[PDB]
Structure formats: structure tokens, C-alpha cells
Design an enzyme around this catalytic site. Structure first.
Site, PDB file in Angstrom:
ATOM      1  N   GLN A  11      16.855  80.650  59.132  1.00 45.20           N
ATOM      2  CA  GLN A  11      18.267  81.001  59.259  1.00 45.20           C
ATOM      3  C   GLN A  11      18.967  80.133  60.300  1.00 45.20           C
ATOM      4  OE1 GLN A  11      19.533  85.182  59.577  1.00 45.20           O
ATOM      5  NE2 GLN A  11      20.681  84.624  61.420  1.00 45.20           N
ATOM      6  N   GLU A  71      14.095  83.475  52.664  1.00 48.36           N
ATOM      7  CA  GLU A  71      15.018  84.490  52.196  1.00 48.36           C
ATOM      8  C   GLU A  71      16.265  83.799  51.662  1.00 48.36           C
ATOM      9  OE1 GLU A  71      17.296  86.225  55.226  1.00 48.36           O
ATOM     10  OE2 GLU A  71      17.511  88.172  54.225  1.00 48.36           O
ATOM     11  N   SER A 140      14.604  77.396  64.505  1.00 51.92           N
ATOM     12  CA  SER A 140      14.465  78.241  65.679  1.00 51.92           C
ATOM     13  C   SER A 140      13.006  78.305  66.117  1.00 51.92           C
ATOM     14  CB  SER A 140      14.982  79.653  65.397  1.00 51.92           C
ATOM     15  OG  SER A 140      14.181  80.312  64.431  1.00 51.92           O
ATOM     16  N   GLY A 143      12.075  82.571  65.044  1.00 44.86           N
ATOM     17  CA  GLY A 143      11.987  83.071  63.686  1.00 44.86           C
ATOM     18  C   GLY A 143      10.622  82.834  63.069  1.00 44.86           C
ATOM     19  N   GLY A 144      10.252  83.723  62.142  1.00 49.75           N
ATOM     20  CA  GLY A 144       8.984  83.570  61.447  1.00 49.75           C
ATOM     21  C   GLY A 144       8.946  82.339  60.561  1.00 49.75           C
ATOM     22  N   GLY A 146      11.297  79.785  60.885  1.00 48.80           N
ATOM     23  CA  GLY A 146      11.628  78.665  61.750  1.00 48.80           C
ATOM     24  C   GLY A 146      10.428  78.137  62.510  1.00 48.80           C
ATOM     25  N   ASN A 206      19.588  79.383  73.563  1.00 47.85           N
ATOM     26  CA  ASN A 206      20.732  80.212  73.200  1.00 47.85           C
ATOM     27  C   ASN A 206      21.379  80.824  74.435  1.00 47.85           C
ATOM     28  OD1 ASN A 206      21.139  79.924  70.434  1.00 47.85           O
ATOM     29  ND2 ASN A 206      19.725  81.574  69.878  1.00 47.85           N
ATOM     30  N   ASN A 228      27.139  77.900  66.928  1.00 51.45           N
ATOM     31  CA  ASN A 228      26.790  76.760  66.090  1.00 51.45           C
ATOM     32  C   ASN A 228      27.847  75.664  66.126  1.00 51.45           C
ATOM     33  OD1 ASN A 228      24.491  78.136  65.444  1.00 51.45           O
ATOM     34  ND2 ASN A 228      25.206  78.809  63.422  1.00 51.45           N
ATOM     35  N   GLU A 254      14.049  54.300  68.287  1.00 54.63           N
ATOM     36  CA  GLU A 254      14.651  54.012  69.583  1.00 54.63           C
ATOM     37  C   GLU A 254      14.765  55.263  70.447  1.00 54.63           C
ATOM     38  OE1 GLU A 254      17.939  51.499  69.059  1.00 54.63           O
ATOM     39  OE2 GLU A 254      18.298  51.153  71.205  1.00 54.63           O
TER      40      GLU A 254
END
Ligand code: GTP
Ligand code: ACP
Ligand code: GDP
Ligand code: CA
Ligand code: CA
Ligand code: CA
Ligand code: MG
Ligand code: MG
Ligand code: MG
EC number: 3.6.5.-
Lengths: 437, 331, 52, 425
Positions: A11, A71, A140, A143-144, A146, A206, A228, A254
Site C-alpha cells: 500500500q 490486496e 514500507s 507492511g506485510g 511491503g 513517517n 505522500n 552514480e
């Protein structure tokens, strides 16, 4: 011209990906339908913007991106969003049930059953690249999908694309917006498995973005959309050198050369300024010296930490807007005395400077004021290890009681991988200490 | 209701402050590893500054400045003064000092020969040797920083004895520099024989190696010392010594302010310091060392600790004549 | 203070200022299949338990 | 679409289950005829979690109704929303269970369980991606307790990888039907410990006290108790029924709330509980009430134990900035009641749509080690009779022997001990 492929996992990566490509289209004058009036080479060409956009005979500039999520609800936003016409269906991949904030579920259980589909879709984009530099992976830590699926994908990319560079934009967990108590587990699990497969990773906490939104943008309770939009700006300043004509950071290799002398220590800290609320009727325009100075204020960093008590291994300044080298050198000289800047002896004490004349692009109706000049600083400082220590401490407290461990073992993961991942992070913390103190 | 944690059970000062905080009925002490705290009375060594300021909704304050050790180390202070333009090597209130790794051996020899060409030095580190021969000092280190020994100290009479002045300074989160009005002199009960009991004014040396003959515990407070200066020398503590002390304190703290300040940091810091001053027979004040975790004279524990709560802790966490002198500095 | 490698173009310019001088595919499959095996073993024991 | 299959078994389970569908059906705009008549798109957003769509845009609850006597289920079919339930999903017998766990689990229930599993199979087969099941029942009777746990065991066997969640009403002598309730409750708790992932412990003792003391009801009825349960069930399922980030599905909720597999019994809590009601509550008031034991329906004192994990849900149009402040205030004021070895174990969610007849509300879900008091209370009552083998003949007549009782008591004593060890960690 060499192409760059963007991969968005989970997500956080997907929603951040959508924000960036909205900014990219604005910056390059690409309309949501994909048409680009300023591109006279219809259906082809090796211009700088072709690094991130391919072209169709119809004149559509299609991003070199793939969105993957276990999802479908988040990637369905792209399918029906403003820039739906930008992507084609093959680029969006969705499963039916997610990783449930469980790294083992994302990596082994669900990942094993979907990995080959993702790689096949990436191969379709790769085969359309004359020379492929590598990949940019957004995701992320907590997240599972991510954390879990990204570590699997990074391994496979290192197999099928061994000679290609891989850069990371990672979201570091913060309780003020965190969605799960086991995020420290997933962060460390994915960092251990991904560490040897990423050439350069930019961590965004975050916590830092949340405070910057509340303080600079006068937002009482920032949401993901606020977070975001700001994150895409920093990402845009980092990737601009790949999308525009320039001589600094023109290819992914680079980034490694200029920012990562030690391969394991490949987490540069990003500082961005100015962040100005768009609600202000009239905004004082900061100077080159002022914004350059703000690059050494902890309150503007993507990760809260104190560089004054670390050591620098490399520093890069990326200016967008009305900037000329004369003013940059004056600002650097001023700061180089007053500010606490301590390099290591085995590195030069200098700054690599890049200037792009186009000032930052503000998404219409956004929260950021249009400024006349901005800068993003990439400095590989040992101070960023404070983020690892914070994460490692939380991991220790839960793992001493084996809290939530059964969820991971129930997915086929061995309990030893917990300790093995933790020892790596202990080694990583030692590496930072050996270089900074 | 404010919360705090105690991570240094050996702090005589903040044990009193902990006692006072609970005596206000508005401070709650937590377990030493509970992270949802407002105030940390942290450990002297390896204080996890990196875990501060990451608790949403919690204003967190700690009683130490990260990086203040540079000012509170024998070699760190020596290097700081030489390499800091604000202090400069031409510093007039700091004794000539060199860092000798068991390195500035060559420079120390250059001055040592130039002197014999008063040439007594004292070697110390973090066990002190006072010798007029460079060989004895240099060998002692290898078996540390060598500093010039003040051969002309100001000796109190009666007793013809040496002393040192301890000054307590509190720096709050705003970086105001506060000097406690009450200082202490740690006198030597033994006459200054130019044995080390009379050369070293350390309290343990006096109470271990004539102790208490002239002043209780070889501790003379400002009022008695001020009266002595008026009688013996027709002057005051403020004019002869105290102005030089406030100048030295301010210079040291202003120098490192940009490095340790928490003005725009995710957590706030304050710290109490102990400054050690030598006074020569010309009534010139010399800086000996800066203590990062000092103790206090028993008579002064109550007033100082309450003041610490007042200006340092209650200023950030308010409850429901100042004993300090605010050394007005600039940004 | 030295300025080196100054490059200019229409879009902008860059320069440098100096202030002072892997596991194979097979091994990945074993890891994934090993985890899948442990899941299958744990499910079989549960079903065996429910059968009892 | 992540669907949940709802099962309600026995008298208590069917009365509470019926009220639950009455409540959420209103919240989603679904009328008694199955037709949507709402005004907010949030209503139909995740409607598929609990409802199926039929011809004519009809919405049909994904609910299966089970009982061994037709009495209660006849009432449901004639109740306010009786016509909304699918007639096929009514599965009932005639013998009854006589408040006997053995009858519901071994003799009378066993005869009917297969036809229930056929209905469950039919609902699951048409699920795009089934996430799991939720069961409503009591532990003190025979059908909900004995047959309900038998269904759970058979559902787990056929769907071993799906989430099993229950709302379980704990018996109390203060609100009692028969003296054998501790026997039935003890036998069920072991089933629950092994075969559920999440169990909301709803104590009738707590429900009665709230009705008598707080709500000022002199003579509480089962309807009054079910009013509290309906409101609670609505609150704890908000995160599943409306758009949101936290605990959006059953598995993520389990991962956040259950640090150890056996310790998955939750204390629910609801605020406000105002008597006669037009006065709006402030965020500080909702938070303080939400964490007060008088608002908790497990009849345990949290200050006698420590919270392993906490989930809070706020409903209505309120200041989110203030919600975060109040929640941060509660944890920092009483930090001694949250285990220090699970950082940030309090997760907060907010939903715009408030419950019917309220401008805002707060639902509390706590995994507290204080729950051991509830199991201790049942263990004492069980042992008082079992030491003299009182009333055992009702169970040995159905094929059970004493050894099974001895194990059940021993298993629950272990459960209490496990809660005690983590309360001192
Ligand atoms: N900055 C930012 N952070 C996000 C965003 N979405 C989620 N996060 C963070 O990501 C973490 C949760 O990981 P997710 O990416 O949502 O989970 P996932 O990758 O979809 O994997 P699943 O467990 O299968 O759902 C939390 O720490 C969130 O704070 C976003 O849009 N922007
Ligand atoms: N350069 C110097 N010239 C003259 N006397 C000196 C000196 N350096 C130290 N001394 C004397 O020796 C004593 C011990 O010095 P030093 O300050 O190193 O001990 P110490 O560091 O333990 C002080 P404290 O107990 O406050 O920490 C001083 O109190 C002073 O009397
Ligand atoms: N809260 C509540 N509890 C009930 C209700 N009906 C019965 N009970 C409780 O459930 C237990 C009796 O079990 P019951 O459901 O009647 O048995 P079953 O029909 O065989 O499943 C006793 O503890 C009752 O107090 C009800 O409508 N609401
Ligand atoms: Ca072109
Ligand atoms: Ca590699
Ligand atoms: Ca029969
Ligand atoms: Mg997800
Ligand atoms: Mg000392
Ligand atoms: Mg009944």
C-alpha cells in the site's frame, strides 16, 4: 539513454508511486491521457524523460512502472484514478488477500505463489529497454507485503538482473501513523534479507514527514495524502537527475559511487527545504544561503537524528530553481565554519553539487507553496544509525518474550531467522560505530 | 501529572531532585526502562540520546547535553581550547597543556627546554605525578596530559596553604547559563611545601593524607573567603576573582553552544557543571577542569537542587530572589 | 575551497567543491519450499489432532 | 471481497445475533426487506463483508441460524428483521439440549451438525475470498456452548487456514438459568482456547451490573442485556464494516491483538452508556469512560492486571487531533498498566458514521491479563460442585466420564496460570 524501471510494492509503495507519477507528469508536461505536446519525436526517441517514460505510436508516454499488491483495493485506485489512462492493465498486479502485517506471510506463503507473475510482468518492461540501468523499489518497512514480498523480489531481481543497480525508497515505521504492533519485526526481517541486494536505500521516517506537515504546512492531523505529496517532492528531487539533462547522478550506478563508499552503509539521509504552506497569502522567498543552511537543521530531515554527533562519508546538494554556483559556494563556505560538519579521514571533505533550473513543481490544490528555489541534500552520515537502534530496541523488548512470534512460525518461517536477522542489525550497528566514533 | 525516570542511582544531586519531585505531589516516578517519561535523570555513561524525542505527545527532557563530554575530558578540553578559534591557543586563563599519548610530546619538550633555557609540570589523566623533570612525568604516563603546575598559588593565611574554587553552573534548555551564588573552596590543611598532601587540594587527599584544623572539612565558603580578601588584601571576591570566573564559564559554554544546543531538536537538554579554578598570588583565575557529573557541598544540596527544579525542570514542566546569576550571553 | 568538474547545459549545471584535501535461484527455491513444507507439516498435525 | 460468514447458535446466540443484524442493517441503510435506502456511499463501501447481493439489488445477510429447538428461531423469523434472513440458512432441530453441554456436543448436536456444515459450505463456496467466521453463542447452555464448540471444531477442520472469531456470553450466578452453567462454561473454554483466534468475552454479570447501576434499570431483562451487546458488537466490527486503515480484516486484528496463541480472550467496552441522553460527550469524556471498568462488559478490573494490547474505535464527527491527544494522555497517565515489552500496543481508529442515536461513541477492545479473574470465577464455581460430583449424572448419561471434566478444569487452571506469568514479566 538508459531506462529505469519503477516497482511499487504494498500500500505505501503504491500510494507513494501514484503521487510521484502525478508529479512526474506535471514536471514533464505530460497530460493524464499520456500525450506530451513538447515531444516532437512521436513514438520514439532517447530524450532524458524517456528514462522513465516509454512512448507508443499513438503518442502516449507510458511510465516504466509496475504496481504490485497482495490486496486489490489500493491498486484499484490507480485503475480508476485521474492517471488511469497513463498505465495499461499489465502494469497493475493485485492479489485477493494481503500479508496481514506479517512478513512471513508476504515472503513465503503468498509471495511464493505470486513472485513468478511479478517477474514476468517486469520482464515485459525490461525487454522494451535498449539499456536498462536498474530498478527503483518503493515500499514500507512495516507492511506485510511491503517488507515480506519486497525482500523476495529483491532476491530474484539480483538473480535475473545481476548486473543491474537497485535503489530503495523505504518507509520507516512511526506509531503516530503505524497500523500494527509487529512493524519492528518486519522492518528488521526485511532489512536483513534485503541488505545485500540494495545498492542504495533512502529511508523516510513517517515521524519526520508527519511533524514537517504539522509544523511547516500547518496541518493539524496530516493524512497519507499530505504525507505522500511531500514525499514525492523529495523523491522527485532525487530522481530529477535521471529524468532531465544533467551531469550529476545521471545513472543509478552514480548514486552508489557518490553516496556509498561502504556497501553495507547504504542509507543516505535526506534533508529538504523549503517547505512552505500554500495557505500563506504571501511567502518570503528564502535565499540560496538560507535553504542551504536549513539542510543542517534536524527539523527538515527525513529521519530525525543529530548529524552533529556523527561523521559524514559523502554529501550531495541537489538544487532546483533560481540557483547559480556563485551563491552555492558562498553559502557552503559560511556553513562550513559555523556549522558542526565532521567528515571521516578516509573521505574527501567536499560537496557534489547539482543545479536544475526548473523550480519545484507544486501539485495544483496541494499543501506546498510554489517556491522560487529548493534544495535536497543527500548526506551519508552515521547519525542515521539512531533509527536502527530505536528499531532494534523495540525488537529486543518483544522478542525477549517471544511476543507474536507464533504468527511468523505458523507461516513456515523458522524462529532462527528472527535471531539471524537481529544479529545482522547488531553487526550493522557496529559498522556505523566503527566509522563514526 | 508529570513522569520521570532515574537511571543513575549513584547521583547524590539528582537523588535529592528525585526526592523533591515526589515531594511536589505532581511528579510520578516510573521504572528505569519505561519510555513514556517526561524527564530522564539518565546514566553518566552511554546515555541513549538516540531514543529521546520519539514518543508522540510526550515532551521529553534529559539532564545531560550530548557532546558536552568534549568540555569534561582532560584531553578533550585541552584539544578544544587549542583548536577552537573562540578560545585559541593564546588563551590566557588556561594553563599551558599538551596531550601525550602513552601526540604532543615534541611540542612539550620544545617548551620544557625553552623554560630551563619555574619549569615544573603536573601529569594527570582519567594517579597524579608532579615533577620538575620531564623524564619522570613522561615515564609515568607510559607506565594522560601534562599541564604546567602553578608554582605561585595564592595561599590562605593563617596556614600558608593551597586551595581551589568549585563553581556550580546550570545550563537550561534555552541555553541560559546560570551560576549558583554559593561556591566552595577546597583548601589544603597542610602548608604549601614547594609529599603531595599540600600540593593536591582534593578532598579525599586532605581527609586521608591537619584535616579540618582551619575550616570544617577543608571547605571555606564564599562569605568567609570574601571577608578574608577584604581583610588580608583589601578587595572583594567579586572584583578579584568572580569576574574572571564568569568570563571563563561563559567562554567555555558559548564555544560549544552550536555543537550541543537543542534549540531545534526533537528532545531538550539541561546539565549541571562543576568548574574548578586555581587562583595565583597575582589574583588571576585559572581553569583547571570542568566536571560533568559533580557532587555538591552538603550545606548547599538543598538550595541548589531546588533551584535545579525551579529553572531547569519546572521551566519545561510547570507545577501548580534567584539563587543563580544569569551570565547574559548572545545567540 | 576549490571548485572542480563544472558542467553546464540548458537545463542546469553541476560541479564539485572540495573544502579540504548472491544466492542462486535453486537456493531460493529450497528456502521457499522448506517453509511450505513446515506449513504442510503443521497443518497435517492439526488435522491429525482433529481426527483424534 | 473478504467475506465473513456469521453463525448464531442456541437461544442466547440467536437473540444476540438477531439484534446485531438489526443494528448494523440500519447502519448500512438496509431495511427489513433487504433493500438499501441509505444516503452515504460509505454505507455500501464494504457491505459485502456481511451481506450478499441478490436479484433486484437485495442485500441478504451472510448468516446461518442454528438451534436444537425451534422456539427462539421462530421468534427471529417473526422478529423485526425476520424476513431479511435467507430461509435456507435456518437449521433447527426439535429435541433441545436441556442446558447440557454433552447433548449439544456429543448426542443431539452431533445429529444436526452435518446439515449445518452443508449450509456453511454453500455460503463459503460463493465467497470471493472468505476471511473467516464469527460465532454468536453463550457458554452456559447446551446448544450454543456444546454444539457451538462442536461446529467450531468441524469448521476449523474443513477451513484450517481461515480466522475463527466468536462472541461468547459468560455465565454468572447473578443472571443464571441452571446450576450446571459452570460445568458447561468450563467445557467450552477449552474448546475456545484451542479452536478460536479471537473471542470477545461478554460476561452477563457485567451486563447486569451496568444495567442496574449505570443505566438505572431496577429489573434488567435479557432484552436490556442484549441492547448493550448489540452496541458492543457494532463497535468492535466497525473496522470490518467501513473504510479504514487499522484492523481492517479479521487476520490483521488477530495479529495486532494476540501476542500468544492461547491468550486471545478480549474485554469489550462501550461508551457512552447514558440513561434517560441528548447531551453530547466530549472526546475527553468518551476516552475516560471507555477505559473505565464500569463501561467494560467482562466483569474484570483492569487495574488488577496489565494490558497486552488495546484497540480503540471512535465513531462520529469529532476532532481527530484531540482523539490522539486524549489516547496519548490515558497511556502516559497509567503507564504501569501496559506491559513494557510490547511497545505502542494501543492502536486507535476513527469512523465518521456514528451509531444510531448518538453523535459520537467509543468502542474498547482490550487483551488484559485481568481476564484471568473471569476464568477464576468460573473455575471456583465448577470446583465447588465437582468435588462432590454434583449434577454429573446429566453428563455421564450422555456418554461422558469424569476424566473429561478433570481435564477441562485442569486446562483452564493452566490458562489462568499462563495469564499470571505474563502479568509479572
Ligand atoms: N508515508 C506513507 N506511509 C504509509 C502509507 N501507507 C501505509 N504506510 C505505512 O506503511 C506501514 C504499513 O505497511 P503497508 O504498506 O500499508 O502494508 P502492505 O505493504 O500493504 O502489506 P499488507 O500487510 O499485506 O497490507 C505503516 O507503518 C504505515 O504507516 C502511505 O501511503 N504513505
Ligand atoms: N596545573 C596545575 N597547577 C597547579 N595545581 C594543579 C594543577 N592541576 C591540578 N592541580 C592541583 O591538583 C588537584 C587535582 O587536580 P585535578 O583537577 O586533576 O583532580 P580532579 O580532576 O579529581 C578535580 P575533581 O575532584 O573536582 O574532579 C587540583 O585540585 C589542584 O589543587
Ligand atoms: N446476554 C444474554 N444472555 C442470555 C440470553 N439468553 C440466555 N442467556 C444466557 O445463556 C445461558 C443459557 O444458555 P442458552 O443460550 O439459553 O442455552 P442454549 O439455547 O442451549 O444455547 C445463561 O447463562 C443465560 O444467562 C440473552 O438473550 N442474552
Ligand atoms: Ca520522444
Ligand atoms: Ca547486488
Ligand atoms: Ca434423535
Ligand atoms: Mg495492504
Ligand atoms: Mg575529574
Ligand atoms: Mg435457554
Amino acid at each position: 539513454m538508459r531506462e529505469c524501471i519503477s516497482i511499487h510494492v504494498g500500500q505505501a509503495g503504491v500510494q507513494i508511486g501514484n503521487a510521484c507519477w502525478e508529479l512526474y507528469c506535471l514536471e514533464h508536461g505530460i497530460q493524464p491521457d499520456g500525450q506530451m505536446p513538447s515531444d516532437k519525436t512521436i513514438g520514439g526517441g532517447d530524450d532524458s524523460f524517456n528514462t522513465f517514460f516509454s512512448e507508443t505510436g499513438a503518442g502516449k508516454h507510458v511510465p516504466r512502472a509496475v504496481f504490485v499488491d497482495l490486496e486489490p483495493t489500493v491498486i484499484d485506485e490507480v485503475r480508476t484514478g485521474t492517471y488511469r489512462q497513463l498505465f495499461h492493465p499489465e502494469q497493475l498486479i493485485t492479489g485477493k488477500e494481503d500479508a496481514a502485517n506479517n512478513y512471513a506471510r508476504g515472503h513465503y506463503t503468498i509471495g511464493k505463489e505470486i513472485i513468478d507473475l511479478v517477474l514476468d510482468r517486469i520482464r515485459k518492461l525490461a525487454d522494451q529497454c535498449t539499456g536498462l540501468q536498474g530498478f527503483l523499489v518503493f515500499h514500507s518497512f512495516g507492511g506485510g507485503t511491503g517488507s515480506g514480498f519486497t525482500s523476495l523480489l529483491m532476491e530474484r531481481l539480483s538473480v535475473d538482473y545481476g548486473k543491474k543497480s537497485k535503489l530503495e525508497f523505504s518507509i520507516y515505521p512511526a506509531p503516530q501513523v503505524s497500523t500494527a504492533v509487529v512493524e519492528p519485526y518486519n522492518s528488521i526481517l526485511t532489512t536483513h534479507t534485503t541488505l545485500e541486494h540494495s545498492d542504495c536505500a533512502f529511508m523516510v521516517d513517517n515521524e519526520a514527514i508527519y511533524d514537517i506537515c504539522r509544523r511547516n504546512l500547518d496541518i493539524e492531523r496530516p493524512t497519507y495524502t499530505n504525507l505522500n505529496r511531500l514525499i514525492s517532492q523529495i523523491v522527485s528531487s532525487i530522481t530529477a537527475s535521471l529524468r532531465f539533462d544533467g551531469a550529476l547522478n545521471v545513472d543509478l550506478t552514480e548514486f552508489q559511487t557518490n553516496l556509498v563508499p561502504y556497501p553495507r552503509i547504504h542509507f543516505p539521509l535526506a534533508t529538504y527545504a523549503p517547505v512552505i504552506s500554500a495557505e500563506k497569502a504571501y511567502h518570503e522567498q528564502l535565499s540560496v544561503a538560507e535553504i542551504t543552511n536549513a539542510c543542517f537543521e534536524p527539523a527538515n530531515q527525513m529521519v530525525k537524528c543529530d548529524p552533529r554527533h556523527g561523521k559524514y562519508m559523502a554529501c550531495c546538494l541537489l538544487y532546483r530553481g533560481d540557483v547559480v554556483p556563485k551563491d552555492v559556494n558562498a553559502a557552503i563556505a559560511t556553513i562550513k565554519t559555523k556549522r558542526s560538519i565532521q567528515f571521516v579521514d578516509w573521505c574527501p571533505t567536499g560537496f557534489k553539487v547539482g543545479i536544475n533550473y526548473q523550480p519545484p513543481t507544486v501539485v495544483p490544490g496541494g499543501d506546498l507553496a510554489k517556491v522560487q528555489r529548493a534544495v535536497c541534500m543527500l548526506s551519508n552520515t552515521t547519525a542515521i544509525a539512531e533509527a536502527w537502534a530505536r528499531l532494534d530496541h523495540k525488537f529486543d523488548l518483544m522478542y525477549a518474550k517471544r511476543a507474536f512470534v507464533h504468527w511468523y512460525v505458523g507461516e513456515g518461517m523458522e524462529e532462527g531467522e528472527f535471531s539471524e536477522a537481529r544479529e545482522d542489525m547488531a553487526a550493522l550497528e557496529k559498522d556505523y560505530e566503527e566509522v563514526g566514533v | 501529572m508529570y513522569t520521570f525516570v532515574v537511571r543513575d542511582e549513584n547521583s547524590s544531586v539528582y537523588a535529592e531532585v528525585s526526592r523533591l519531585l515526589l515531594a511536589t505531589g505532581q511528579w510520578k516516578r516510573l521504572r528505569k526502562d519505561n519510555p513514556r517519561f517526561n524527564l530522564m535523570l539518565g546514566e553518566r555513561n552511554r546515555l541513549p540520546f538516540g531514543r529521546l524525542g520519539h514518543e508522540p505527545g510526550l515532551v521529553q527532557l534529559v539532564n545531560y547535553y550530548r557532546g558536552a563530554d568534549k568540555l569534561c575530558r582532560k584531553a578533550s578540553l585541552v584539544k578544544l581550547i587549542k583548536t577552537s578559534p573562540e578560545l585559541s591557543e593564546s588563551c590566557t586563563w588556561f594553563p599551558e597543556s599538551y596531550v601525550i599519548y602513552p601526540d604532543e610530546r615534541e611540542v612539550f619538550l620544545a617548551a620544557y627546554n625553552r623554560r630551563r633555557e619555574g619549569n615544573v609540570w603536573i601529569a594527570k589523566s582519567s594517579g597524579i605525578l608532579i615533577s620538575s623533570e620531564a623524564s619522570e612525568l613522561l615515564d609515568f604516563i607510559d607506565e594522560h596530559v601534562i599541564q604546567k603546575y602553578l608554582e605561585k598559588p595564592l595561599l590562605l593565611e593563617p596556614g600558608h596553604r593551597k586551595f581551589d574554587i568549585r563553581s556550580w553552573v546550570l545550563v537550561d534548555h534555552l541555553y541560559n547559563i546560570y551560576l549558583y551564588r554559593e561556591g566552595v573552596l577546597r583548601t589544603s590543611s597542610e602548608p604549601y611545601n614547594s609529599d603531595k598532601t599540600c600540593h593536591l587540594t582534593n578532598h579525599c587527599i586532605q581527609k586521608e593524607y591537619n584535616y579540618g584544623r582551619y575550616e570544617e572539612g577543608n571547605e571555606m565558603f564564599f562569605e568567609e573567603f570574601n571577608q578574608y580578601l577584604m581583610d588580608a588584601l583589601n578587595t572583594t571576591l567579586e572584583n578579584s576573582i568572580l569576574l574572571q570566573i564568569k568570563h571563563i564559564i561563559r567562554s567555555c559554554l558559548m564555544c560549544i553552544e552550536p555543537a550541543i544546543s537543542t534549540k531545534h531538536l526533537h528532545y531538550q537538554s539541561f546539565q549541571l557543571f562543576g568548574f574548578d579554578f586555581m587562583v595565583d598570588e597575582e589574583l588571576k583565575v585559572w581553569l583547571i577542569e570542568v566536571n560533568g557529573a559533580p557532587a555538591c557541598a552538603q550545606k548547599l544540596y538543598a538550595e541548589l537542587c531546588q533551584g535545579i527544579v525551579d529553572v531547569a525542570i519546572s521551566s519545561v514542566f510547570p507545577l501548580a530572589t534567584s539563587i543563580f546569576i544569569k551570565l547574559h550571553h548572545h545567540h | 575551497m576549490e571548485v572542480i568538474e563544472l558542467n553546464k547545459c540548458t537545463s542546469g549545471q553541476s560541479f564539485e567543491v572540495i573544502l579540504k584535501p548472491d544466492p542462486s535461484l535453486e537456493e531460493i527455491q529450497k528456502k521457499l519450499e522448506a517453509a511450505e513444507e513446515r506449513r504442510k507439516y503443521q497443518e497435517a498435525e492439526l488435522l491429525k489432532h482433529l481426527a483424534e | 471481497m473478504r467475506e465473513i460468514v456469521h453463525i448464531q447458535a442456541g437461544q442466547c446466540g440467536n437473540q444476540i445475533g438477531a439484534k446485531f443484524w438489526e443494528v448494523i442493517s440500519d447502519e448500512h441503510g438496509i431495511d427489513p426487506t433487504g433493500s438499501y435506502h441509505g444516503d452515504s456511499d460509505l454505507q455500501l463501501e464494504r457491505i459485502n463483508v456481511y451481506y450478499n447481493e441478490a436479484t433486484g439489488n437485495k442485500y441478504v445477510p451472510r448468516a446461518i441460524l442454528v438451534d436444537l429447538e425451534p422456539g427462539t428461531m421462530d421468534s427471529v423469523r417473526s422478529g423485526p428483521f425476520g424476513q431479511i434472513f435467507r430461509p435456507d440458512n435456518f437449521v433447527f432441530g426439535q429435541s433441545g439440549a436441556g442446558n447440557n453441554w454433552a447433548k449439544g456436543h456429543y448426542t443431539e448436536g452431533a445429529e444436526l451438525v452435518d446439515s449445518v456444515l452443508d449450509v456453511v459450505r454453500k455460503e463459503s463456496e460463493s465467497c470471493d475470498c472468505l476471511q473467516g467466521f464469527q460465532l454468536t453463542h453463550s457458554l452456559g447452555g447446551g446448544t450454543g456452548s456444546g454444539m457451538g464448540t462442536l461446529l467450531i471444531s468441524k469448521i476449523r477442520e474443513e477451513y484450517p487456514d481461515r480466522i475463527m472469531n466468536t462472541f461468547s456470553v459468560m455465565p454468572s450466578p447473578k443472571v443464571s438459568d441452571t446450576v450446571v452453567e459452570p460445568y458447561n462454561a468450563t467445557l467450552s473454554v477449552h474448546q475456545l482456547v484451542e479452536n478460536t483466534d479471537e473471542t470477545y468475552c461478554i460476561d452477563n454479570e457485567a451486563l447486569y451490573d451496568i444495567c442496574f447501576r449505570t443505566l438505572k434499570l431496577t429489573t434488567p431483562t435479557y432484552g436490556d442485556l442484549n441492547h448493550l451487546v448489540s452496541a458492543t458488537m457494532s463497535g468492535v466490527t466497525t473496522c470490518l464494516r467501513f473504510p479504514g486503515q487499522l484492523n481492517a480484516d479479521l487476520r490483521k486484528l488477530a495479529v495486532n491483538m494476540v501476542p500468544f496463541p492461547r491468550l486471545h480472550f478480549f474485554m469489550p467496552g462501550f461508551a457512552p452508556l447514558t440513561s434517560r441522553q441528548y447531551r453530547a460527550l466530549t472526546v475527553p469524556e468518551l476516552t475516560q469512560q471507555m477505559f473505565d471498568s464500569k463501561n467494560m462488559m467482562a466483569a474484570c478490573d483492569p487495574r488488577h492486571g496489565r494490558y497486552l494490547t488495546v484497540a480503540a474505535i471512535f465513531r462520529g464527527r469529532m476532532s481527530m487531533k484531540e482523539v490522539d491527544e486524549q489516547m496519548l494522555n490515558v497511556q502516559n497517565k497509567n503507564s504501569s498498566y501496559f506491559v513494557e515489552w510490547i511497545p505502542n500496543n494501543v492502536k486507535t481508529a476513527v469512523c465518521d458514521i456514528p451509531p444510531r442515536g448518538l453523535k459520537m461513541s467509543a468502542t474498547f477492545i482490550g487483551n488484559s491479563t485481568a481476564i484471568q479473574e473471569l476464568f477464576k470465577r468460573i473455575s471456583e464455581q465448577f470446583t465447588a460442585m465437582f468435588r462432590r460430583k454434583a449434577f454429573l449424572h446429566w453428563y455421564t448419561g450422555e456418554g461422558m466420564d469424569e476424566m473429561e471434566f478433570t481435564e477441562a478444569e485442569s486446562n483452564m487452571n493452566d490458562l489462568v496460570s499462563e495469564y499470571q506469568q505474563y502479568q509479572d514479566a
